[PDB]
């Protein structure tokens, strides 16, 4: 079941792997130097370690995590969308059957950052990080049971449920936390550059 | 492994999970004694046994049927005793639910032989004597899904034969007196 994943996500998956918090602290530091491929590589490690815990709790094993490029798209002079594209390989295993499907995973995480207008002491507002099912894409690559066998659709739906739970419980919260660690002057500097 | 729950149940005895099993046993003993009917008590006993197995496993065996208990005299005072068993099997797995429907045939075979006591021979748990035929699967028959289902049912059926069905078969025959068994052998 997803019972073990539910409890793990309630505790926090970093309770299963103390190096997650260390990678988080490395990311915060690296980010403070934007305004003064390392960040992407820390994010790959972060996301990798998170999904490594998930593999211990579930049959959904996500690895080969790549983050090609973090980008910022200005939506005004005072706000921008921050995009984190994620790709990964997924293998779903079930009891007795072993490996039932191999999938290509694409997840696009997006969060807005905004700077208050009409002051020289501008506060920063990090917007919500939304777990839109359209942001999660799974492509069937292989199944030793046959590509059109019913077990494939079971594997796909199980992987989407797992990824969606992990995005809501871990990735989006950490994304917001990282952006909230940036300096007001830094976010200001970044939003302007994205126009 | 997966059969740990079944194995412990077989260690305690499956009648510890369903008090009606022993009642049928006594009914059978009386029924057999009466022949000096039985098939229906036999169906009931085997059915209840597999209903306990379904509480301990994903292998659900029901619609149990015993056509005719055959007895073939091998001498003046000995005979081969055959109980053919047919049943419907559904195997379930976590997540996937029911993976395969199977046709089961089991042949329970022993010997009875005649101051003088009634000897009941071995009850051999031969996997040649367990036949599982695939009827239906949601996941096709090309796959290893059916293979896993068949192998699961075979091991469950095999364990229950050795742990429950063959010992009970021997006890029921041992429960007849030398005169009773002598009369039944003659009726061939
Ligand atoms: Ca909490
Ligand atoms: Ca990289």
Numbering used by the authors:
A (entry chain A): 38 to 73, 80 to 238
B (entry chain B): 37 to 72, 81 to 158, 164 to 237
From the study:
Crystals of a double Phe-to-Met mutant of BSP30b diffracted to 2.0 Å resolution with a space group of C2 and unit cell dimensions: a = 81.65 Å, b = 59.57 Å, c = 89.94 Å, α = ƴ = 90°, β = 106.25°. The structure was solved using SeMet incorporated protein and SAD methods. BSP30b crystallized with two molecules in the asymmetric unit. Electron density for the loop joining α3 and α4 is absent. The hydrophobic channel of BSP30b (~22.6 Å in length) is enclosed by all of the secondary structure elements. This internal cavity has an opening located adjacent to the C-terminal helix (α7) at one end of the long axis of the structure. BSP30b also has a conserved disulfide bridge common to the PLUNC family (cysteines 172 and 225) that joins the long curved helix α6 and the loop region between helix α5 and strand β5. The first difference results from the presence of a second disulfide bond in BSP30b. This second disulfide bond, formed between Cys72 and Cys229, connects the flexible loop just after helix α3 to the C-terminal helix α7. Intriguingly the electron density for the disulphide bond is only clear in one molecule of the asymmetric unit and missing in the other.
Further investigation of BSP30 revealed that it is a mixture of two closely related proteins—BSP30a and BSP30b, sharing 83% amino acid identity, with expression restricted to salivary tissue. Notably, BSP30a and BSP30b are abundantly expressed in the salivary gland independently of one another and the proteins are secreted into saliva, accounting for 15–30% of the total protein in bovine saliva. From a structural point of view, the PLUNC protein family belongs to the TULIP (tubular lipid-binding) superfamily. Each molecule consists of 7 α helices and 6 β strands as well as connecting turns and loops, which constitute the conserved TULIP fold.
